[PDB]
Each structure stands twice: as structure tokens, then as C-alpha cells.
Amino acid sequence: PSPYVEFDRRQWRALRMSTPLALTEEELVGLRGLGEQIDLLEVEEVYLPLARLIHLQVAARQRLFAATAEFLGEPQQNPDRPVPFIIGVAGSVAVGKSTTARVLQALLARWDHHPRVDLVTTDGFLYPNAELQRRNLMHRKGFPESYNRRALMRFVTSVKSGSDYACAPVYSHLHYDIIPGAEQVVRHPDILILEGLNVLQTGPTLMVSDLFDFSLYVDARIEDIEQWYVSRFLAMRTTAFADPESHFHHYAAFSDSQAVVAAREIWRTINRPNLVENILPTRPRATLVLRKDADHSINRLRLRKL
Amino acid sequence: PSPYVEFDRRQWRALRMSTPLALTEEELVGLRGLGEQIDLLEVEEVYLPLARLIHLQVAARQRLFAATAEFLGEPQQNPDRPVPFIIGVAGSVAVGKSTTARVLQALLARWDHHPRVDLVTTDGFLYPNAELQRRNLMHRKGFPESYNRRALMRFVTSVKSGSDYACAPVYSHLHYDIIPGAEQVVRHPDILILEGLNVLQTGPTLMVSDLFDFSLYVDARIEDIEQWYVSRFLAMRTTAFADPESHFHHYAAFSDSQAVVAAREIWRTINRPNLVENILPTRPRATLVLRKDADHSINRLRLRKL
Ligand SMILES: N#Cc1ccc(-c2ccc(OCC(=O)O)cc2CN2CCN(c3ccccn3)CC2)cc1
Ligand SMILES: N#Cc1ccc(-c2ccc(OCC(=O)O)cc2CN2CCN(c3ccccn3)CC2)cc1
Numbered sequence: 001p002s003p004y005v006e007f008d009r010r011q012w013r014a015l016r017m018s019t020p021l022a023l024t025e026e027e028l029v030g031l032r033g034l035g036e037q038i039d040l041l042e043v044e045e046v047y048l049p050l051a052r053l054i055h056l057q058v059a060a061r062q063r064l065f066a067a068t069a070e071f072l073g074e075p076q077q078n079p080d081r082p083v084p085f086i087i088g089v090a091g092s093v094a095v096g097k098s099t100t101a102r103v104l105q106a107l108l109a110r111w112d113h114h115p116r117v118d119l120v121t122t123d124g125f126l127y128p129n130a131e132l133q134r135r136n137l138m139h140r141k142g143f144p145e146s147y148n149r150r151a152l153m154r155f156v157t158s159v160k161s162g163s164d165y166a167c168a169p170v171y172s173h174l175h176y177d178i179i180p181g182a183e184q185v186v187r188h189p190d191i192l193i194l195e196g197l198n199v200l201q202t203g204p205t206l207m208v209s210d211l212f213d214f215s216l217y218v219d220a221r222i223e224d225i226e227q228w229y230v231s232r233f234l235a236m237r238t239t240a241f242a243d244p245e246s247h248f249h250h251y252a253a254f255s256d257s258q259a260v261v262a263a264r265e266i267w268r269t270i271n272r273p274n275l276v277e278n279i280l281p282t283r284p285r286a287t288l289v290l291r292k293d294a295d296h297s298i299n300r301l302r303l304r305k306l
Numbered sequence: 307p308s309p310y311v312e313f314d315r316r317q318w319r320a321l322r323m324s325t326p327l328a329l330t331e332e333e334l335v336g337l338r339g340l341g342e343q344i345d346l347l348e349v350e351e352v353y354l355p356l357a358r359l360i361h362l363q364v365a366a367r368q369r370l371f372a373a374t375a376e377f378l379g380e381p382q383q384n385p386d387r388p389v390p391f392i393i394g395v396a397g398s399v400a401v402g403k404s405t406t407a408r409v410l411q412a413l414l415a416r417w418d419h420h421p422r423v424d425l426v427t428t429d430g431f432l433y434p435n436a437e438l439q440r441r442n443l444m445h446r447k448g449f450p451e452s453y454n455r456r457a458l459m460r461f462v463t464s465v466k467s468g469s470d471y472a473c474a475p476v477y478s479h480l481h482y483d484i485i486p487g488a489e490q491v492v493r494h495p496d497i498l499i500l501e502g503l504n505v506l507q508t509g510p511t512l513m514v515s516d517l518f519d520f521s522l523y524v525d526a527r528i529e530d531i532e533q534w535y536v537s538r539f540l541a542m543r544t545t546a547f548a549d550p551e552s553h554f555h556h557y558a559a560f561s562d563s564q565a566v567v568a569a570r571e572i573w574r575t576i577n578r579p580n581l582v583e584n585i586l587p588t589r590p591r592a593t594l595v596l597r598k599d600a601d602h603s604i605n606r607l608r609l610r611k612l
Pocket of ligand 2: 447554
């Protein structure tokens, strides 16, 4: 006996679930352009059933807010509306957290109950490169210490406080660094999805995940993720690395053969270690685990028993 | 702003409650049954509203369980009832956790939604004294390493998994040790309260607090708790120390001045620093912080915004 219900892909299909609520095919157009390669059978069969499920919990939280407010007899100090409902998404680099997030943000916003869904990445809570160097941390971008954990805690606290706005820094993926003076403003949305490698990580402190209301871990075999990371690296020669402005411009010129070697090395020495030591252990802390096959389709869902 | 709504004693009392919540006959009589001078006015005016508030959360989760199972068209692999709803109670030694937990267990059981409330203390997961000496830990009883954290985790997991039964060892407070062979057997209660020093503690592992649905931290000025620790020691000359079988019998004969010195020293060297290092830092992880006045009465409630 486990604290999770487990459904393989066959079983999850083989239900028997409530709504049509099916997708408008004007919305399926908007859904294609959240690149990389968005499978639409994935959305219909997995992410929409998932979104409905999460809506159940967001709705339950909303009613419970109201029932409690009513029991307390709407006192001054009680807030007027439920505080944002925060979802965490965790997983290895290159597992597709970002895609998973953008898809859930688009689906969950379809309900009248909670139409304002914000998405923030913890990438903005990285120390700037300058500070990273200063701490011997350039080879460890994405490990726990490479984030300003205090600032990140302040951000989420403030959001969960129900404050009017909350500012986050913005990480530029092209420049591989924080953007000086850039800020993402967050104004008490109904849901906030928080995406990052570190969002389910433990701490002697209070940690951000104490402020979640739901969390996903996006899981895959480690071999499989390596393969995605390599294919991604080679593809970046055309785009990120192509700009002569990039610090990683010199990778643009590597042949396929040599780029594979370079990818696999960066994998082995930064991300794979980060995954095993720090990311994988936070997996059993997620409300829902999604295991993806080698070709990106979800082959197993684990869901905490309610 | 803050993620807690805050009421003090007056505000909480003076509130327009949406029910005539009065305790019955019969209710007060059975509550005198725990009545190590339990203040029944506090029980009616503070604990009962609090119990009602926790009830709302239990009933919301119970219905979510139902909405969710209905949505998945109740699959064979889905459980047939909500798993137990688990409540942590933490705080300093001699802060009154155990009283607070027993009172809550009595008040929560009165709803038909969940008449079966169990109570377990993490005291039962301490290593036996013989294992403690073996580890140079006799002087750190109640520090985190003094518990079999693995067995404790297995216990809470098993209950949150929905097992028919789960066992926990049993601690004799008068003999200061585990009772060999004793077991407390928990059988899918509707609600399980888990009381202890360490219940809200962090670990790199999946920790027990990951399995709670709600948690209490019982708070007080550190000075006050010392005063109560000292008084309780003096009072113990008459109860626990009075037995000449006891390992601490010799304390029964110490007079007020010496007993104060002895008590104050034990506090300064074991309990106080356990509180500062390991217990105080978990306080912000709780859903509800109850803070008691020098005279044991609750004077502030901080509740997490919904
Ligand atoms: N020293 C050193 C030193 C030198 C070079 C690199 C390096 C070069 C090219 C890369 O292109 C492939 C890609 O970008 O996938 C990737 C990396 C390493 N990654 C940087 C982004 N990191 C994170 C992690 C979390 C959030 C944002 N960013 C995770 C690790 C790394 C370290
Ligand atoms: N070495 C040593 C060594 C020797 C003696 C004592 C000792 C003697 C008499 C005491 O009587 C006063 C009282 O009982 O309040 C209290 C203690 C210390 N406390 C024992 C209970 N401990 C815990 C903690 C969690 C759960 C249960 N128990 C917390 C620390 C302590 C350490």
C-alpha cells in the first residue's frame, strides 16, 4: 500500500470520466504554438483530464475559503478573496517542465472560477553570473545554492499573503543571465504556476513548497532525458548559439558529431549530477507524478490519495 | 502583509460565529475526564470554534475525495473512502501540546462526518534508552536523531496510504522508556492527530509533515515555558519521582530551592536548546499557531489565509 493511486497510460485512457468540455479547435490552434513539439492527443487525453482534476481542488479551496469566512462572520482581518492557489512543477533540466506548465496555464484559465493563471519560473531567482563567479558557482547553475533562496521565499510568501502585487526578476535564456532591472509583476492571480528545478526542495528553514497547494513532478528515465538534452543542444546551434552576442557562440560551429560529445559532457558534469543529488529526491513530495516515455508521451500517472 | 490572519483573545471571543455552538451535558463531563485542571471556558470559547474551523477543512477534503472519484468514474485502483485526515501538533516540551491534542481529539469526534479521531505521539518512536546510550544520545532525548525517523515515516505513510491497520510503539512517561512489546494500533481513523516535538521538522528525505492535511504549533514566550517546566518538575516530586522504583526518585526529596536549580539546569541544557535549534524554526510551517499567555490561556491565533 502506497500514498498514491497509479494509472498507466492504458488505464488512464480506459476511463470513463465526466465532461465532454472538449477543445474548441480555435483553442487547439493556440495550443500548437507553445513550442517545442506539442502533441495534441497528449492534450486531449492527459492534460485536459489533469486540468479538470486540478480545477476540482482549486474550486474546493475557493468554497472552503468562503465557508470559513462565513463561519468567522467576515471579520475585518479576513481577506476578501481566496489568496492565489499556487502550483509547483519540478523535474530535471530538459524534461519539459516549461511546456507542461504553459499547457496547464492555458487549460486551467478556461474555467470562470479562476481565469487568471500566472506562470513564473525560478530561473529569475538565480544569482546573476557575476555573483555566481564570485561564489565559485558558475559550474553549478541550477543547484540549490545557485538561487537566491531568500528572495524567492519573499516572492512566494508575498503572493500567498494575498498582496496586491509581487515582483520577480527575469532571467534571459539567450544571454544566460539575469536581466538588469527587468521584473515580472504578479497581481493576485487566481492560480500561480511556479516552474523550476528547485521548487520541491527541502530546507531547514521554511521552504517555498510549504506554500504550494498542488505540485507536479515531471519524470522520465535518465537515459531518455540525456537524449532530449543532446538533441536540444544540437538544435540550439541555429538559434541561441548562432547569435554572436551569446557567451556560447563558439558551440555554434561544432559539427553534429562534436556537439554530441560536448552536450554529453555538460550533461554528465552539471545536469545529471544536479538531477540525481537534488531533484530526484523531491519526486515523492509531489501531489502528482507524470512519467514520460522516450518520445515524450506520458506512460504513467501517480496521484496522491485524497 | 503576511500569509496568516491574526486574531487575539478578545477578537476571537467577541466574534459573530455563524452557529450557536454550545457544548452539551455530558460534553463538559467527558472533558473533565482529561481534566488535569483543563479550563472548560477556554475549551468552549477557543478550542470549539477552532474545532469547527478544522471540521470545515475535513469536510471539504471529504467532498473533494467524492468529486474526484466521481470524475474518474470510480476506478478499481481508487480507494473507496478518503484516507485519514492527519493533523500535526508541535511545540516545545511542556508547552501543553498533549493537552491541546487531547482536547481537539475530543471536540473533533463530535461531528458525524468523522466521529473516529485517533491520537498518536511521536514519543513512541524514540529509540529505547539502551539504543540511546549506545549512540551517545541519552542527553539529547527529543532531539531529531533520538527518534527512529525511518519507522515513524513508515507509520504515517501507512496510515496516509489507507491501510486497515498500522502499529506504533508505546512510550512510558513514568519510566522514561519504550515499553517492550506494547503497540498502539491505528485502524483508518477519519482523523489522526500526531503530536510531538519533531512533527513539523524538515529533512532531505520525504518528511512526515508532507503527509499532514493540517498542523498546529503551540507557542509561548521561552521564559514562560521555562516557568512551567520548573513548576512541573517540582510537582513531579509528588507523582513520577515519588515512586522509589523510578530512576529519578532521589529528586522527590529535593526541596524547592534545590529542585528549582535541578529543573532549571535540565531545561538550560536539554529542552531549551532543543527548542531554539529544532522546534522554534518549524513554527512558521504550521497552518495554525496558538500562542499562550504566562497563565496558560491562549492570547493569539495565527491562521494561514485560505
Ligand atoms: N562553468 C560552467 C559552465 C559552462 C557552460 C555551461 C553550459 C553551456 C552551454 C549549455 O547549453 C545547453 C543548454 O543550455 O541546455 C549549457 C550549459 C550548462 N547549463 C547552463 C544552464 N543551467 C541552468 C539551470 C537552471 C536554470 C537555468 N540554467 C544548467 C546548466 C554550463 C556551465
Ligand atoms: N543524559 C541525560 C538525561 C538525564 C535525565 C534527564 C531528565 C531527567 C528528569 C526529567 O524530569 C522532568 C520532566 O520529565 O519534565 C527530565 C529529564 C530530561 N528530559 C527527559 C525527557 N525528554 C523527553 C523528550 C521527548 C519525549 C520524552 N522525553 C526531554 C529531556 C534528561 C537527560
